[PDB]
Every structure is written in C-alpha cells, then in structure tokens.
C-alpha cells in the first residue's frame, strides 16, 4: 500500500480485510480491500480475478467504483470509493423507527438501475445481500462485492449452484436446476425490498430444505402452471407438501397497491416469467420517486 | 473507444501454436470441449494481443496460462480446469502447479487485470478466419 494511511478496519471475511484509508492525491478517503492469498497455491483467488476484471469495465453511478489494483508477490490490494455504511447497518439502525417509504422506493429504484446496467452488459451479480449494498450521506445506494459475480454473455458456459446466501437464494437454484440467469438477482432484490419495509428478513431459513419451505409458507407450493417445470427438476421429490398462498396485503402491511404488484412479479416462481430489471424500473410504483438524504444524528 | 486492429501476422503466429504435437494431442484429449472450446480458444488469442506477446513469447506454456485464465474467468466448474497442469508441467504437476498459477497472475497483471472477454469480441476474432478447425470445436452440455 504505502501511499495509503490506514484509518480503521471495517469489514472482514474469507476474502480478506476491508480498511478505511487516505492518499497522496489529497485526503481522498477510500476503502482499501486486502485479499487473503491462498496458503498452498499462493495464487489470486477466482473470486478476486472475476471481481477486478468486471469492476475494471463497470462504470455506473449505482455500482461501487474501483480506483486502483496493487498486486505484489504475496499481496493483492483493491482501492474502492469510500461509502459511509452498508444497507444492513442502516436497516439495523432504523429497525425500530423504520426506513421511510420514499427512501425505500429511492434505494430500490437505484439498485434496479445498476442491476439493469449489469444485465444489459451481460453480468450476473450472484451475491445480492444488504451487507453487499453500500449507502452514502447524500442518499445514494450502490451495488458492492462483485466477488461471486460473473459475465453471462459467452454461451454454453458452466454455472455453479453455490452462489448466494440462502435468505436471498433463487428457488431454481434451491431446486438444483441448471440454466439460471438475470432472474436470480431479481429474487435477491425482491427479498431485500420486503426486508426494508417489514424491518426483518423475508424467508430466514436454517437449511436448504427449510428455505424452500419458508418460500412455500408465503408464496405457496408451486403448480405446473405458475412454474411450468416445477415437478420435472433434478432436486425434486414427490414428498413436498402443498400449501396455501397468503395475500401480499398480509405479507407486507405498510406497502401500497403498486408496491405489492412489483414485489409479487420480483418473487415470481418461473424464471422465464419473473420480472426483468428493465421492466421493473417502468412500474407505476416509481412515478412519485425522489432522492432523499438518509438519517444520521449524534 | 476499445478498438484494436488485428493483422494477418498476428493470427498466423497464433495458429503456429497448434503445429506443436503436444498442443494437438491436448486438443484431441479434450473431446467434450470442457476446457478448450472455440470460445476459450478465442479468449486465449485475445489475452495474447492484450498482454502484447512478441513472436518469441508465442510459446506452449504461454498458451496454457492464458487458457487457464480463460477457464478461471468464464467456467464455474473449478475441477475441470486442473487437467491443464500435466500438459504444461509434465508428470510432476502435483507440486509444480502453484508456480504455473504465479505465471497466470503475471499474465493477468500484464493485461491490466482486464480478463473479461465478451461474446461480441469472441465472434469477432473467430470471423477473421472461420475456416480454421479450432473454431469447429463446439460444446453442447455446459
């Protein structure tokens, strides 16, 4: 690093440690991400190459900007634009009062704008969670952590099922069915949208078979009409129980008629009939949308 | 704009890699095209021009590190790409593979970490000479 004065430690994981730092180009406050280089192979992880290779070509106002890439014998640093806090930290801070509806609307519209840019430029985020979405003091949200992200442009390429956290995981992956796309990311943002309104996770599962049951608890067990190929799947068993699909009015009480229509289309069972990032932006829900500053007091 | 003019001598030097008996045996080995298909072979040429490889730098080892990078970027199945190690590191690959990965990162550094190769670009490099047999290497099951 050298030319970066480390202020404080923020994040940490299997990937590495995230810090707050300054520069030689003024007091440019940044997010310095140190990568945990493998013990035996001592090679750059596949997740790091994919993240750096994608972000070096993604320049959208709702996608976290990559500034510099420092690579040495045993080190790999990632310079990012500093953003005050993540969505999870803001949802925890506004867990009792609650995030205001115009601000929920603003964030969803901004996240959709960035995701539409990804899907149009054939890129799957594959890891949309509140910890992986960064906010700033002037009311702007960004798509962060492109670690599990990949370019879906090239055809006949192979795809893995170990992609996103259970809570935001698509049912077409929960039912181990191959051939997934753009719709997977939509399912994660639909779960994030509901979480912002009800102040709690939509389907908080404890396992893979429990996650599916939490989905069929709310959206009901799917039939061969809502999802044409629900039974004909690699990880399907006839022992699956049929359940009633409770109305969205009950599911999300503070959301309006338009908000319920958008949420349902995002949480659609069929990936070929699930709303696209482009179609969701056009929804009548975003007709009275404004960009408000988030809550911050001493 | 992200433009690059590809000359005859750039594609001629790249096709000379397939004149080596080790390389032709390696392509033969890969029947299902899991690790070295037309798109991954389109990607390996793209990486060569990106790293700005000279005539003397057009070696068999450089072909495998670029193909491994293409498999690291576009293929989610991590297990399949390990078949590259015995073809470039001989029959002692079980402990020779980390030094290959160091070269793979060295090439990734040489291309300014721009390892994303689009379908549009792949179809564009394929179209220079579509009559070539390496572009006749199609896949069906991912």
């Amino acid at each position: 690093s050298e030319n970066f004065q480390k202020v404080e430690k923020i994040g940490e994981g299997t990937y590495g440690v995230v810090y707050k730092a300054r520069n030689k180009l003024t007091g440019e406050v940044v997010a310095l991400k140190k990568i945990r280089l493998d013990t035996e192979t001592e090679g750059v992880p596949s997740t790091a190459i994919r993240e750096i290779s994608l972000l070096k070509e993604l320049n959208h106002p709702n996608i976290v900007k990559l500034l510099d890439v420092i690579h040495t014998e045993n080190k790999l640093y990632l310079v990012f634009e500093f953003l005050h806090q993540d969505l999870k930290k803001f949802m925890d801070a506004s867990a009792l009062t609650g995030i205001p509806l115009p601000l929920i609307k603003s964030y969803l519209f901004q996240l959709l704008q960035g995701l539409a840019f990804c899907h149009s430029h054939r890129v799957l985020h594959r890891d949309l969670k509140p910890q992986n979405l960064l906010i700033n003091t002037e009311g702007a949200i960004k798509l962060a952590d492109f670690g599990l992200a990949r370019a879906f442009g090239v055809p006949v390429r192979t795809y893995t099922h170990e992609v996103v956290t259970l809570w935001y995981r698509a049912p077409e992956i929960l039912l181990g069915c191959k051939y997934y796309s753009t719709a997977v990311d939509i399912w994660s943002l639909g779960c994030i949208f509901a979480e912002m309104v009800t102040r709690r996770a939509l389907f908080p599962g404890d396992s893979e078979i429990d996650q599916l049951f939490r989905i069929f608890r709310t959206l009901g067990t799917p039939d061969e009409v809502v999802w044409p190929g629900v039974t004909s799947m690699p990880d399907y068993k006839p022992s699956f129980p049929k359940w009633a699909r409770q109305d969205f009015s009950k599911v999300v009480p503070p959301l309006d008629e338009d908000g319920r229509s958008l949420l349902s289309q995002m949480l659609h069972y069929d990936p070929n009939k699930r709303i696209s990032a482009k179609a969701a932006l056009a929804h009548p829900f975003f007709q009275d949308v404004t960009k408000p500053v988030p809550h911050l007091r001493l | 704009g992200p433009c690059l003019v590809i000359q005859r001598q750039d594609m001629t030097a790249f096709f000379k890699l397939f004149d080596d008996d080790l390389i032709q045996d390696f392509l033969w080995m890969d029947c299902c095209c899991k690790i070295a298909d037309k798109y991954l072979l389109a990607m390996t040429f793209v990486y060569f021009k990106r790293a700005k490889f000279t005539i003397s730098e057009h070696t068999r080892i450089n072909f495998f590190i670029a193909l491994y990078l293409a498999n690291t970027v576009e293929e989610d199945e991590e297990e399949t790409k390990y078949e590259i190690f015995p073809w470039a590191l001989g029959k002692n690959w079980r402990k020779l593979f980390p030094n290959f990965l160091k070269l793979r990162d060295q090439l990734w550094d040489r291309i300014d970490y721009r390892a994303i190769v689009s379908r549009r670009c792949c179809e564009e490099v394929m179209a220079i000479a579509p009559t070539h047999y390496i572009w006749q290497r199609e896949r069906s099951v991912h």
Binding site: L54, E57, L58, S120, H121, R122, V123, A151, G153 | G1, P2, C3, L4, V5, I6, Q7, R8, M11, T12, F15, V46, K49, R50, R114, I116, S118, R119, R120, C121, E124, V125, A127, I128, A129, T131
Partner: peptide, 19 residues
C-alpha cells in the same frame, strides 16, 4: 502458405456485451 484476413478492425476488443 496461409489464408487469413490481411487487416481486421475489431469495434469492441475490450469491454462487456450490450443487450
């Protein structure tokens, strides 16, 4: 002897797709 295109201009060499 080799039969390959003498001069080829690639509009998009670096970057991602568009759809």
């Amino acid at each position: 002897e080799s039969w390959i295109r003498e001069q080829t201009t690639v509009d998009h060499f670096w970057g991602l797709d568009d759809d």
